Amino acid sequence: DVNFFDELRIGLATAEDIRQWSYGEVKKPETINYRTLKPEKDGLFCEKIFGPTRDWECYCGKYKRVRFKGIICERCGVEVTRAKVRRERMGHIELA
Amino acid sequence: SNNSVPGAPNRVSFAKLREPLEVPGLLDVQTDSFEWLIGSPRWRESAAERGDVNPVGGLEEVLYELSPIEDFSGSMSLSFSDPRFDDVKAPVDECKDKDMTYAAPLFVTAEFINNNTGEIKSQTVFMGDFPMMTEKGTFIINGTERVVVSQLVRSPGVYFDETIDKSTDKTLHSVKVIPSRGAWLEFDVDKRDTVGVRIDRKRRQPVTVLLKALGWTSEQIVERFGFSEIMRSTLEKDNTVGTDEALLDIYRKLRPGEPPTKESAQTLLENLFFKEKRYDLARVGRYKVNKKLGLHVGEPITSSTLTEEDVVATIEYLVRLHEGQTTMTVPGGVEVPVETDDIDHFGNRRLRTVGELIQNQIRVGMSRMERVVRERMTTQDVEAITPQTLINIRPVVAAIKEFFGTSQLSQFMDQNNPLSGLTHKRRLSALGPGGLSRERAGLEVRDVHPSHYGRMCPIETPEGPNIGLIGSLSVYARVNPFGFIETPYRKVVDGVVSDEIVYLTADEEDRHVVAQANSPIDADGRFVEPRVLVRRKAGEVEYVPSSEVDYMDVSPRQMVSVATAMIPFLEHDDANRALMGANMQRQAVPLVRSEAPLVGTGMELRAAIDAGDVVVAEESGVIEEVSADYITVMHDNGTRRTYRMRKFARSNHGTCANQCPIVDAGDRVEAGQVIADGPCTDDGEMALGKNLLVAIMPWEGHNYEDAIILSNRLVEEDVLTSIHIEEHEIDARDTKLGAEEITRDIPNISDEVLADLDERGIVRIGAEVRDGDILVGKVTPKGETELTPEERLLRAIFGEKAREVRDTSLKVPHGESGKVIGIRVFSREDEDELPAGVNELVRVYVAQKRKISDGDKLAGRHGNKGVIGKILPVEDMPFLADGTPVDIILNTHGVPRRMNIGQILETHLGWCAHSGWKVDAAKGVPDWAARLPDELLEAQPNAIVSTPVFDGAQEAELQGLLSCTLPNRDGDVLVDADGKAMLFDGRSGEPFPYPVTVGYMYIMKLHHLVDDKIHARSTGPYSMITQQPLGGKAQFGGQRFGEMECWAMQAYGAAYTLQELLTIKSDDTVGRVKVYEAIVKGENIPEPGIPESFKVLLKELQSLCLNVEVLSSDGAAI
Amino acid sequence: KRLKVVAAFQQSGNSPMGMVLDAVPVIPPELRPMVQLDGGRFATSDLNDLYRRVINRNNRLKRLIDLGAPEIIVNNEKRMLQESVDALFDNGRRGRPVTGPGNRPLKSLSDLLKGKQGRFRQNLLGKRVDYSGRSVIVVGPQLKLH
Ligand SMILES: [Zn+2]
């Protein structure tokens, strides 16, 4: 990022803006699977919404090389990138 | 021989006064208490001496208060009495060896009453193992030597007070009867002139309410309290009229909104203060209440709960305290004085020691056992019940084992040397479970109180934030049954001093007039002068005509501790430097050789023999054969006693403990004589340092600002070498992936590195280990992942499989070296007790030998610390007219600033002890030596003198001793009448232009060594969650960069340095990786930008539905 | 006092509509980690229990609307959803806080900003660094002032 911030400003969000920040919707209450200790599909830890676990790896195992940057796997939908995005992509919930 | 000890080497003494009583066994406080708790004949004999009509053990008392248990039918019951112990499981040394606890098993004789049947069944119940105290006064929990510390609390009792009012400008007298355990009662006069009682921090009600509530008719109130006006006014001001109306009132102010019955109120008033189980005074509280009110002084009351007559006596006393009446009398009671109490005075501060403290845990655990027994006797059948089924041993075993594990007051024994341990056991601690907090204790609780004189040392205390909160028991002081500290006096009936001595407490002493041990005495005991100086009441000193003198002090050093007692010329220092001196002596490292000090106090033979680290001889006999390992003595009886000497034990604080047979073979040894020399002891004497030739001057700024110049001769001769013994421990614990193992081969380590280990996996004994080396070779079964393909080709070209095991081998931390002296292993097959889930534990001992050098701390005895800033080579030290070079050069500028000149006198006297002297006694005795003892007229070179505390060499006597020093083996005399000598400069070779003061001093090597206190860290291992460098001196953690260092940075204007510290040097992982990489690569370090932490602050503010955008110069977002 | 609060929303360009949430953000998964300890035990963060809770009460409410139900049941479920998200944003701010294990209040999401350990206080207190050490100092009167 550019090194030049004149000033910071804060405000209120909007549902039409909170939908913009988000990468998926968490709709299942469940966290990581108990057996294998991988995250559970479409919940508070899943790789689809947030990020892959190890660096440059999808979920099912159809890609574990580094040659493919930025591709989205069509069998499970995770994206092979650095695992550091695992702390920059935000979820969203839609309340009835 | 004036000294009691059989074969003690004798010190001529500058003692002017004969001591009436010899100093008691120093570890008495630690042994007596525990002897009382177990219940032993020795303690029974002591109670025979006191003449106590009640002989009871601490365990026996806790068994009376529990027995008998009964079911609410009363149809089944269970009581038990008469504890008895057994032989200890094993001897002490084996327990230090095998990691177990030296204890003894313990039974009781319990019985089960039955009413409807009429048959009572008795049997022997076992009650786990019980930790027992050794003769040294210490506990061995889990193989380590621990120590229970005595604790200072306020006793139970009745404390009157007077507090000034802010609104009406007039003082208000409030009482509190504070018991041992039970509800607080309290009475108080008001600014509106209205008495109010307050029961368990309830809302005040009128006090004639409770008075009427016990059963006091209005007429009896009128006649008993009639003379008092504020009590009468409070009998008007009350509203509730009648008995039950007041029990109902008390229930209605006890809790609001509860159904008020007359029977439940009358039941709770006698349930909270007169029920035996719910509320209790101890013997301390009961005795003290009796003594303060002057009622029931003749008979010993076994009942230990509050009584009603007592409460009426208290309210009459409070009204008396408002009156200003000196004397009260109660019907049925002797007369007493009337004054407000003081919580600081030592007659109110009782002290509860090991016996009381272990008794409390036995009690609480016992209660948790009693509930279980009560439910268990209700459920089981009357025919199939035995006293075996009811009692459950487990809940008490838990309580004790958790006391010795967790309780604040059972610490690791401080074992730097003998003096440190002996001091650790005599400690009076104010902190802990059941006392005032550290933040809660006001600034008055922490300072000296005129009643500590002779019980608690005013000088000795810790220096940090626990000042005043830990004192030390004085030399002669001893603790009586109830829990007060007593000091012995001698009594002067009519100006003549007796030989019989009485031990007084702090509150009994306030009632007489005590004269000090320097009063001039005839040979009859007749007072030499008309007026004596005396201490009267509290904090008052005054002259008195010789008839008003009741008591007198035992010894002029009655008011100091045991560590303070070993500071020659202590009345010449100030209290600050005296404090650092006492404090510092208990951090001296024991050397490889010991010598006793040429100038010392009479205290060190006694202290050494008591602190328990010299081996004494039990009987009298003749030495059979001497080993390095054991001494065998032949009694005159005919039976032989063999004593072991533990050789190089790792004491608790990493220093070494060594015992050395001192007697020669075929000798006659008296009973109770020293036979071996523990660490720090020479010839049976507390030797904490060495004698060194010191010269006082500045020397070309190498000792400037309190550093010290050492002569190289010390490092070559090994005068200050020590032995430090380490230990490291690693083990083989099961994980679900598999069971780890300790085995010789280790993947990817060459043969040379593994040469030291054997086939077992542990390093052989005596192989010098540089750090990073392997001591124990262990491998965890590596977590089963997939074998990496890049690693399949890398390992494929060579053909080496990363097995199912990673390498977690014990390694040598950086900064350690030495030999491997001994290893030790625990297995499941050996039948060793192991922790739950680990199969073998392995420890390894590494012992190095430290020579002194730069950056080690030295200290004299008067709190003159210092670091060694230089070590000159032998031929540079300023040397003496006969070519002896001095050893240490202590600067001048710190003597007159500290305001402690005891070190200069210690140096002068020390030089006189070195050379020996011969007064001019042919012409006659010169005047300055009139009162000099006869054994002192003439000493042989290197003779060890003693100068006690507050009674040593005077000035004129010292100055006169410096004129008679024996001339040197060359013929000449080296120091003049002043104590100054002529020195030659080692580098220049000229003589210095003035005389410098040389002489001897006693210097000790403290426990702040540069090898411990050095850590550096370029990178290391981080912590997953805080993501900062992992702290610790043992993992070479990184050193912390607080907030005032940032304010310094910003006052400089150093933007880039501070931004660098705060970001890539601690938090940002990306940053640290990039900087490390760029440094190894040899390119510029990246210019510091925006922390990765920023984006996280924004993701969290974006989590709270706030919306944060960044504005550029122009005003557009980014 | 009303005028001040009201005129704020006029100057901002931000509608007050943003005070009722039609959606809630979920914080990234790392800043509420669930890492596995050395002894096989799972160590997690407290926010996970709150998000899970709001997710539950939400899904159950929507199926309930699907089925059809009495008004008291739907109003009770709406109520629980509002209170749940309320405690997720800031605990113990309305009635009883929520406790998870053993009567221990849960660390809320507004809990990650306030306090001695919050994100604003973090950089002011100071941390331990790299490339550093310390030791005992002796005087050396041979050295030049630099
Ligand atoms: Zn996939």
Q: What is the secondary structure of B907-971 as a DSSP string?
A: HHHHHHHHH-BB---SS---GGGTTS-GGGSB--TTPPEE--SSSS--HHHHHHHTTSBPPPTTS
Kindly give, in sequence order, each residue whose CB lies less than 8 Å from that of residue B650, ignoring residues fewer than 6 positions away: B656, B657, B725, B726, B727, B845
CA distances from B1020 to A7, B91, C131 (A): 37, 46, 10
Resolution (A): 3.5
Cα(B788) to centroid(ligand 1), Å: 19
Instruction: Say if CB B1094 and CB B1070 are below 8 A apart.
Output: no
DSSP H or E run through B253:
helix B243-254
Q: Which residues line ion ligand 1, judged by CB < 5 Å?
A: A 58, 60, 62, 73, 75-76
User: From CA C85, how far away is CA C74, in angstroms rounded?
Assistant: 17
Give how far the C-alpha of residue C98 lies from the chain's centroid of Cα atoms, to the nearest Å.
Answer: 13
Phi-psi category of residue B324: left, alpha or beta, with phi > 0 → left and psi -120 to 50 → alpha: left
Nearest CB to B1105 within list C25, C123, C129: C25
Task: List chains adjacent to chain C, taking adjacency as at least 3 C-beta pairs closer than 8 Å.
Answer: A, B
From the CA of A57, how far away is ligand 1's center (Å)? 8
Contact yes or no for B477/B351 (Cβ under 8 A): no
Which residues share a beta bridge with B619?
none
Residue of chain A whose alpha carbon sits nearest to that of B1088? A3
Give the Cα separation of A38 and A57 in Å (integer).
13
Strand partners, B69: B78
Annotated binding-site positions of A for Zn(2+): 58, 60, 73, 76
Which residue from B170, B154, B153, B171 is spatially nearest to B162, judged by alpha carbons?
A: B171
Tokens 């002067």 label which residue? B492
Method: cryo-EM
Question: Angle at Cα B510 formed by Cα B505 and Cα B512, nearest 5°?
Answer: 105
Residue C12 contacts A where some CB pair is shorter than 8 Å: yes
Q: How far is CA A58 from CA A45, B44, B955, in A?
A: 14, 81, 91
Q: How far apart are CA B936 and CA B349, in angstroms?
A: 45
Q: Dihedral through CA B909, CA B910, CA B916, CA B917, nearest 10?
A: -10
- Identify the closest residue of chain B to C25 by CA–CA distance: B1103
Distance CA B567, CA B1020 (A): 47
Measure B804 CA to ligand 1 centroid, in angstroms. Answer: 29
DSSP character at residue B513:
E
Pick from C34, C27, C29, C82: which is nearest to C54 by CA?
C82
Distance from C1 to chain B by nearest Cα, in Å? 23
Element (H, E) at B224: helix B218-224
Residues 12-31 of chain C with CB under 8 A from chain B are: 18, 21, 24-28, 31
| Strand B531-536 relative to strand B513-515, pairing | antiparallel
Is the peptide bond between B993 and the residue preceding it cis, with omega within 30 degrees of 0? no
Q: Work out the minimum CA distance from C65 to partner chain B, whole angstroms.
A: 27
Name the closest residue on chain A to residue C66, using Cα atoms.
A96
**Whether the Cβ atoms of residue B647 and residue B629 lie closer than 8 Å to each other:** yes
A71 at B interface, C-beta within 8 A: no
Query: Which residue is listed with tokens 């005396």?
Result: B534
- Rounded to 5 degrees, φ, ψ at B548 are -75, 10
- Enumerate residues 90 to 109 of chain C having a beta carbon within 8 A of any beta carbon in chain B: 109
Among C31, C112, C130, the residue with its CB nearest the CB of B1065 is C130
Whether the CB of C109 is below 8 Å from some CB of chain A: the reply is no
Q: How far is the CA of A31 from the centre of ligand 1 (A)?
A: 19
Q: Does C7 touch chain A (CB under 8 A)?
A: no
Q: What is the largest CA-CA distance in chain C?
A: 92
Tokens encoding B189: 């006069």
Cβ proximity of C111 and C91 under 8 Å: yes
| Token output for B922 | 């042919």
Tokens matching residue B124:
């022997």
The whole-angstrom separation of Cα C140 and Cα C136 is: 13
C112 Cβ partners below 8 Å, 6+ apart?
Answer: B1100, B1103, C31, C47, C118, C119
- Read off the tokens for C76: 């009770």
> Which of helix, strand or coil describes residue B858?
strand
d(CA B923, CA B676): 46
Dihedral sign, Cα of residue B275, residue B279, residue B283, residue B285: negative
A79 CA to middle of ligand 1, Å?
A: 8
Q: Pick from B545, B457, B570, B419: which is nearest to B494 by CA? A: B545
Distance between Cα A54 and ligand 1 center (Å):
13
Distance linking the first and last C-alpha atoms of chain B: 96
Report CB contact under 8 Å: C29, A29: no
Alpha-carbon span C32 to B520, nearest angstrom:
81
Among C30, C45, C81, pick the best mutation site for testing chain A contact (most A Cβ within 10 A). Answer: C30
Place of tokens 């269970």: B78
Identify the closest residue of chain A to C56 by CA–CA distance.
A29
Residue A30 near residue A40, CB atoms below 8 Å: yes
Give residues with Cβ within 8 angstroms of B455, minimum separation 6: B346, B473, B474, B477, B485, B486, B487, B506
* Residue pair B814/B791 in contact by the 8 Å Cβ criterion: no
B409/B404 Cα distance (integer angstroms): 9
In whole angstroms, what is the distance from residue B446 CA to residue C125 CA? 32
To the nearest 10 degrees (0 to 180), the angle between helices B207-214 and B308-323 is 150
Q: Which helix (H) or strand (E) holds B508?
A: helix B506-509
Give the phi and the psi of residue B713 in degrees, each rounded to 5: -50, -30
Pairing of strands B738-739, B722-735: antiparallel
Encode burial over B372-407: b for 16+ CB neighbours within 10 A, e otherwise: ebeeebeeeeeeebebeebbeeebbbebbbebbeeb
Chain B residues within 8 A of A13 when measuring between CB atoms: 1102, 1105-1107
Q: Residue B144's beta-bridge partner residues? A: B141
Query: How many Cβ atoms from other residues are within 10 Å of residue B419's Cβ?
Result: 26
- Other CB atoms within 10 Å distance of the CB of residue B1097: 17
β-sheet bridge partners, residue B542: B534
Look at A44 and C62 and tell me if their CB atoms are within 8 Å.
Answer: no
Name C136's Cβ contacts closer than 8 Å, sequence gap at least 6.
B855, B867, B1008, B1010, B1013, B1014
Residue B570, φ and ψ in degrees, nearest 5: -75, -25
- Quote the minimal CA–CA distance from C102 to chain B in Å: 22
Residue in C21, C40, C109 nearest the CB of B1103? C109
Contact B184, B200 (CB under 8 A): yes
Other CB atoms within 10 A of residue B94 CB: 12
Facing A96 at nearest CB: one of C19, C29, C61: C61
Region of B215 (left: φ > 0; alpha: ψ -120 to 50; beta: rest) is left
According to DSSP H, which parts of chain A are helical?
Answer: 15-21
Q: d(Cα B95, Cα B90) in Å, to the nearest integer? A: 7
One-letter amino acid at B271 equals N
Query: Chain C window 38-77: which residues touch A at a Cβ cutoff of 8 Å?
Result: 48, 51-52, 54-56, 58-59, 61-62, 65
Q: Is the dihedral of CA B222, B224, B227, B231 positive or negative?
A: negative
Residues of A in contact with C18 (CB under 8 A): 12-15
- Name residue B487's beta-bridge partners: B504
Of the candidates C125, C129, C111, C120, which has an alpha carbon nearest to the alpha carbon of residue C49? Answer: C111
Helix or strand or coil: residue B832?
coil
| 3-state SS class at B245 | helix
For B289, phi then psi, to 5°, come to: -65, -45
Q: Which residues of B798-814 are buried (b: 16+ CB within 10 A; e: fewer)?
A: eeeeeeebeeebbbbee
Task: Quickly tell me which residue has 């598999």 as its tokens.
Answer: B738
If phi > 0 it is left, if psi is from -120 to 50 it is alpha, else beta; for residue B140 that is beta
Question: Is residue B623 within 8 Å of B663, Cβ to Cβ?
Answer: yes
Torsional class of B249: left (φ above 0), alpha (ψ -120 to 50), beta (otherwise): alpha
**Residues in Cβ contact with B176 at an 8 Å cutoff, skipping those fewer than 6 apart:** B158, B159, B161, B184, B185, B186
Torsion of CA B413, B416, B418, B422, to 10 degrees: -40
| Phi, psi for B456 (deg, rounded to 5) | -120, 140
Give the three-class secondary structure for B1004: strand
Q: How far apart are CA B213 and CA B1096, in angstroms?
A: 68
Which residues in chain B are contacts of C134 at CB distance < 8 A?
1015, 1039
Contacts by B202-209, CB closer than 8 A, 24 or more apart: B202/B253, B202/B254, B203/B253, B205/B249, B205/B250, B205/B253, B206/B234, B206/B237, B206/B238, B207/B231, B207/B234, B207/B315, B208/B234, B208/B235, B208/B238, B209/B238, B209/B240, B209/B246, B209/B249, B209/B250
B194: exposed, middle or buried (Cβ count in 10 Å: 0-12, 13-18, 19+): middle
How far is the C-alpha of B419 from the C-alpha of B614, rounded, in Å? 12
Q: How far is CA B533 from the centre of its chain?
A: 35
CA B1089 to chain centre: 53
How far separated are the first and last CA of chain A, in Å rounded?
Answer: 38
Q: Hunting for tokens 């085995």 — which residue is that?
A: B743
C-alpha closest to that of B659 among B644, B672, B670: B644
Check CB contact under 8 Å for C55 and A86: no
> Helix B229-237 vs helix B207-214: angle between axes, to the nearest 10 degrees?
80
Question: DSSP letter at B876?
Answer: G
Q: Which of C22, C46, C40 is nearest to C109 (CA)?
A: C46
Q: Give the Cβ contact number of residue C7 at 10 Å.
A: 10
Ligand 1 centroid distance, CA of B1009 (Å): 60
Helix axes B28-38, B354-379, angle to 10 degrees: 20
The continuous run of DSSP H or E covering C63 comes out as helix C47-67
Residues in chain C: 146
Q: Are B804 and B839 in contact (CB under 8 A)?
A: no
Is A69 an 8 Å CB contact of chain B? no
In 3D, which of B1117, B1002, B292 has the Cα closest to residue B604? B1002
Annotated binding site of A: 58, 60, 73, 76
Q: How many CB atoms lie within 10 A of CB B550?
A: 15
Tokens of B176: 């509190």
CB B382 within 8 A of CB B77: no
The identity of residue B731, as a single letter, is D
Question: Of C31, C52, C58, which is closest to A96 when you measure between CB atoms?
Answer: C58
* Chain B interface mutation, best of C93, C128, C134, highest count of B Cβ atoms under 10 Å: C128
Edge-to-edge order in the sheet of strand B76-85: B69-70, B76-85, B103-114, B121-131
**How many angstroms separate the alpha carbon of residue A72 from the centre of ligand 1?**
8
| Interface-testing mutation among B1014, B1036, B1100, with chain C (most C C-beta atoms within 10 A) | B1100
Using the Cβ of A13 and the Cβ atoms of chain B, whether some distance falls under 8 Å is answered with: yes
Q: Which residues pair with B181 in a beta bridge?
A: B280
- For chain A, counts of helices (H) and of strands (E): 1, 2
* C-alpha–C-alpha distance, residues B79 and B125, integer Å: 12
**Under a CB-based contact definition with an 8 Å cutoff, are residues C145 and C125 in contact?**
no
- Residue B969 amino acid letter: R
The Å distance, Cα B790 to ligand 1 centre, comes to 21
Quote the CA–CA distance of B849 and B722 in Å, as a whole number.
Answer: 6
Report the b/e string of B1006-1027 with b at 16+ CB within 10 A: bbbbbeeeebebeeeebeeeee
Q: In sequence order, what are the beta bridge partners of B693?
A: B1000
